[PDB]
Amino acid sequence: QTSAVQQKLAALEKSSGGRLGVALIDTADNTQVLYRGDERFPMCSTSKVMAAAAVLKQSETQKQLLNQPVEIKHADLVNYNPIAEKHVNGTMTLAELSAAALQYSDNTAMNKLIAQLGGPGGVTAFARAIGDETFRLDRTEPTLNTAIPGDPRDTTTPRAMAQTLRQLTLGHALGETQRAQLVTWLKGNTTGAASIRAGLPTSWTVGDKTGSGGYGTTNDIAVIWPQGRAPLVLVTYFTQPQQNAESRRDVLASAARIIAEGL
Numbered sequence: 001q002t003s004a005v006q007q008k009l010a011a012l013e014k015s016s017g018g019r020l021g022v023a024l025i026d027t028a029d030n031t032q033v034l035y036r037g038d039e040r041f042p043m044c045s046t047s048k049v050m051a052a053a054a055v056l057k058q059s060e061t062q063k064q065l066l067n068q069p070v071e072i073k074h075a076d077l078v079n080y081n082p083i084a085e086k087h088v089n090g091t092m093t094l095a096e097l098s099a100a101a102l103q104y105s106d107n108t109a110m111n112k113l114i115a116q117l118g119g120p121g122g123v124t125a126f127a128r129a130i131g132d133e134t135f136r137l138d139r140t141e142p143t144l145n146t147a148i149p150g151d152p153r154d155t156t157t158p159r160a161m162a163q164t165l166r167q168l169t170l171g172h173a174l175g176e177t178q179r180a181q182l183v184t185w186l187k188g189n190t191t192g193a194a195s196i197r198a199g200l201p202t203s204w205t206v207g208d209k210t211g212s213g214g215y216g217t218t219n220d221i222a223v224i225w226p227q228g229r230a231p232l233v234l235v236t237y238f239t240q241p242q243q244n245a246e247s248r249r250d251v252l253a254s255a256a257r258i259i260a261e262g263l
């Protein structure tokens with residue numbers, strides 16, 4: 001069947017000229033709303049959540065791991081390094097790198113997380129360990145953001161990412177203190193006010209991670225605490241047919257607004 005909400009999302013998608021993927025989990029009743037929920041989309045920087053969570057999992061058996069220093073050399077700088085560039089010829093801890101990756105979307109910080117896990121396949125292995133059979137990370141920053149249509153590398157589906165985000169932030173994929181740390185980091189994101197958040201009532205609290213890349217790809221994944229009801233998880237992925245397309249954070253906000261109306 002096609003629901004009213006799905007019809008509105010289709011109309012939004014038609015006007016946008018791109019391809020929109022949405023998955024909502026309402027944890028009050030565990031019901032789901034999906035639009036292209038099983039199609040693959042490039043994750044771009046939304047993958048930083050999985051990398052940070054994989055390092056948090058490692059820290060469960062190493063109480064000092066998050067204080068471990070990592071050398072930042074000039075050659076490590078990639079294309080967007082707002083935090084890491086201040087520490088060239090110095091060090092950052094794994095906690096500092098996780099915070100920079102999640103809250104500022106620092107690409108050098110993400111590469112240090114990937115390296116701590118043994119490469120992109122270490123991130124994928126963690127996804128499999130927590131029940132995500134769909135996620136795949138194949139490349140490092142910045143090339144994981146090429147976002148070429150039809151390319152399977154560095155992709156997931158909206159359904160799989162919403163399930164994983166729920167398990168990481170509201171479930172038991174992580175230990176209790178690690179889950180709390182992930183939630184704190186997401187709630188302090190600096191990059192999200194124009195994306196899912198912009199489509200929701202201002203009284204709600206949101207923790208989110210954005211992404212963007214080639215082909216006008218514009219993404220956001222969020223855990224949402226609405227006023228007076230159980231939390232939601234919402235994934236909004238969007239990509240366009242031409243390599244140089246302009247990003248459309250407003251489309252993610254519009255999708256979130258349609259979802260919120262339908263609750």
Ligand SMILES: O=C(Nc1cccc(-c2nnn[nH]2)c1)c1cc(-c2nnn[nH]2)cc(C(F)(F)F)c1
Nearest residue numbers: 045080105142143145146210211212213214215
């Ligand atoms: O690294 C990129 N982007 C980036 C970097 C840091 C944070 C975020 C972000 N965080 N949250 N939202 N965006 C996004 C990036 C962008 C493009 C692009 N854009 N347009 N056309 N090509 C192409 C590439 C590459 F290398 F694959 F060719 C990389």
Ligand SMILES: O=C(Nc1cccc(-c2nnn[nH]2)c1)c1cc(-c2nnn[nH]2)cc(C(F)(F)F)c1
Nearest residue numbers: 079080104105106191210211212218247248249
């Ligand atoms: O820094 C960014 N991107 C980037 C970086 C380096 C190279 C290229 C590139 N390569 N080729 N063409 N551009 C593009 C970037 C983009 C967005 C965004 N844009 N639209 N919606 N969100 C958001 C963020 C952040 F971090 F603030 F969340 C960063």
